[PDB]
Amino acid sequence: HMASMIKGKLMPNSLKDVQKLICTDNVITTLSRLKPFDLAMLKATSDNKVKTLLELKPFWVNKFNKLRLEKDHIFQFRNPDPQSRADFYCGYVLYLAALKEKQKEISSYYDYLNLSFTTFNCFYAAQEILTFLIGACKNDTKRENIDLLYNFVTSQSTQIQEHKTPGCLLLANAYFYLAGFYLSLDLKAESIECYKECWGQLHLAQLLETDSEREIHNAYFNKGLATSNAFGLNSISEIKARCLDLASEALPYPARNVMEANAVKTFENRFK
């Protein structure tokens, strides 16, 4: 039973001393040779008074700039906007670790992905979570499987729109698949509400594109938008055009206008 009470509440005990040592200048050298997983778990799994290791900023700038993509030695991450380099570093490290446990231990795939997403709002943890949930709903197409993915999508929208354009394209992604899920299950009123819902994310990403050059650079590893959407298209206008083209009956002119108005409303107030 103990496993069910303790879910995500265990700091590797190799970090007890560093958390004690922290809660200076010798820390800077203690912190500097934990392996990247342990550093990310220290910031992810500490009292909230130690989590304010947000003075140590040159430490994170050096670690952030050593972040590479194994698949492209040319690529280098750009300033992660509003989020700290510490949080982009630690979220991305935990994301990679989750993929490494992907097929050897699933209970760490969940836990690390959850830490990556919930603690540091890492975009890749969001994209990985959504892809797995969509996969779960591809196989088991029941209405309370779709409703669960739907309910997760709506609860995490606002936090996922902190990545602007990629977040909104990610969110438009989930709504499009939700819409196709409800349709096949003959729940056409809800199929419509997610097609309109997907149009609104597409338009808000559209409004935010010019302010998310760095977000798009990091989100797609400087490869553009092709992998942000199931159509492999390179521009949002191609995404909308193909999308309306598939869902014309669910996206009437006024329907597209309500969502576009609401999308402008969030850009109006919540952004800049």
- The residue ranges that bind a copy of itself (CB under 8 A) are 1-11, 13, 16, 19, 23, 45-50, 106-107, 110-111, 113-114, 118, 121, 129, 132-133, 136-137, 140, 145, 148-149, 151-152, 154-159, 162, 270
What's the length of the chain? 272
- CB of 136 or CB of 258, closer to a copy of itself: 136
Shortest reach from residue 139's CB to a copy of itself, in Å: 9
- CB of 14 or CB of 248, closer to a copy of itself: 14
- CB of 114 or CB of 235, closer to a copy of itself: 114
Shortest reach from residue 36's CB to a copy of itself, in Å: 20
- CB of 45 or CB of 218, closer to a copy of itself: 45
- CB of 168 or CB of 225, closer to a copy of itself: 168
Shortest reach from residue 224's CB to a copy of itself, in Å: 28
Exposure b/e, 167-202, CB count within 10 A at least 16 = b? bbbbbbbbbbbbbbbbbeeeeeebbbbbbbbbbbbb
Shortest reach from residue 55's CB to a copy of itself, in Å: 17
Shortest reach from residue 179's CB to a copy of itself, in Å: 17
